[PDB]
Amino acid sequence: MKKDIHPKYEEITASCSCGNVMKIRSTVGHDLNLDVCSKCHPFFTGKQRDVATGGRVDRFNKRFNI
């Protein structure tokens, strides 16, 4: 690369809430502290929530009850 025209690209440490602590290189400045990550995101359960659209006739059976 050219010198002295690029941002300070240093190695920082990123710690998510799920426990995945990872070592990257970025211009944050140091010590990024995350909340969610790749193995913390609900892409395996949370994507399916409104996919479960629910019924309408069972709601009737939750009100008829007989």
Binding site: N33, D35, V36, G46, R49, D50, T53
Partner: protein, 114 residues
């Protein structure tokens, strides 16, 4: 912080700061901070990281910002494609809870442009 997807207020107490999430008002936020063991008079700046995490799983018990909007919009689209009376007034854009339209209902109908 980043509670449930967004949450960057500051200088506010946590009962009012939590209400920035689409899906929680003053009484649901009091239920969050009671179940989290957090006093309601604290700012978000004075929150330790050992307190922000126990709100994130606490707020995850209620349908909030992301999957709430697609829930509400589908239920409207459930009515509008049903052809029912409330769905019919949702289409034209007119009040659906059985209130007058002779003189009022500027909220549903926007401004009086002509």
């Amino acid at each position: 912080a980043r509670i449930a997807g967004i949450n960057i207020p500051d200088h506010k107490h946590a009962v009012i700061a939590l209400t920035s999430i689409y899906g929680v008002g003053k009484t649901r936020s009091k239920a969050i901070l009671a179940a989290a063991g957090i006093a309601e008079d604290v700012k978000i700046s004075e929150l330790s990281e050992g307190q922000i995490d126990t709100l994130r799983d606490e707020v995850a018990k209620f349908v909030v910002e992301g999957d709430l909007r697609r829930e509400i919009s589908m239920s409207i689209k459930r009515l509008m494609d049903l052809g029912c009376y409330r769905g019919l007034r949702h289409r034209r854009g007119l009040p659906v809870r059985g209130q007058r339209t002779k003189t009022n209902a500027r909220t549903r109908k926007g401004p009086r442009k002509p």
